[PDB]
Design a protein around this ligand. Sequence first.
Ligand SMILES: CNc1ncnc2c1ncn2[C@@H]1O[C@H](COP(=O)(O)O)[C@@H](O)[C@H]1O
Length: 341
Amino acid sequence: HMEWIQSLPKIELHAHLNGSIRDSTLLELARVLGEKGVIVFADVEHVIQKNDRSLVEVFKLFDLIHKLTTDHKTVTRITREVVEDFALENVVYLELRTTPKRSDSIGMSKRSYMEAVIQGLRSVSEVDIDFVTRKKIYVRLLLSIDRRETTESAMETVKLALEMRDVGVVGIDLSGNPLVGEWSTFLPALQYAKDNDLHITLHCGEVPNPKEIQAMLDFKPHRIGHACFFKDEDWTKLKSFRIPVEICLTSNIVTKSISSIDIHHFADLYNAKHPLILCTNDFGVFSTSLSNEYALAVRSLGLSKSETFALARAAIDATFAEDEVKQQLRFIFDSASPEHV
Ligand SMILES: CNc1ncnc2c1ncn2[C@@H]1O[C@H](COP(=O)(O)O)[C@@H](O)[C@H]1O
């Protein structure tokens, strides 16, 4: 069961860098910061331990994580570790998304934060990596706009993404607390990104919000994430616009955004032949792996090995990679296909 799924080549399209941290790394960072007196280690260890990861509590957890991880050398470390972890379960293509941070007291700009991410990619040595333009993994980057930001700070992220297209930035995400901010703040920056040929993925429908869901669909992003609280008119529009959905099974169940895997919309989308991609979202926060997500889907839908492999391969055309990378991915999958029957 889990062994063949672990061996399947897989494509990860929705993984937030600071949601993908090893527990042992987070606790080590906390210990060091406590020895310096920045935090009380026992309280921090407690929140990492006890936060029930309901939707409200998840964003409190991210505020704590960011207190532990926002410095250049830590960004470099966790970038390398996340790439290693995905490569070890035979992710062959990763779009890693992260919110560039500004931290004036340590001389960190959004640009230097992203330069520390690039340094993390350059530091990968346990696997072979392709990110510009023994397992091998292709990595491309999405820069996240957090819904707490302003239009002008969102525009700084978009401008930075355009400047970093040579080191594998391919797109922009809108994410962060779905209870905060207005679509009208971010639509103008996302439109600038889209008009400059960046690919766009939007977190959409994480909470009930009918006007915002319709407005995000009308923008015609290249992908959306989650789609938990769509109504029928939203599904009809989504299916007509053919926007792929990044499906986050464990996340949606843990946050109580979806009552159970057996009603999760990924099954309706699968049966309607609508593009979907199984994703981890935050494999550290939610204690999962991409192989575990596939295992949940495979059990729930009763997929054969051939159907599972076909679903995994279908994610290629939803990537934001250059066409040459997609051609390489088609070669990788077609070459592995006979082993998954
Ligand atoms: C539960 N599902 C989610 N919904 C909305 N936003 C999420 C998220 N999971 C992660 N993020 C976004 O990703 C950031 C952490 O990684 P980075 O600091 O960018 O690497 C969070 O602060 C949040 O804005």
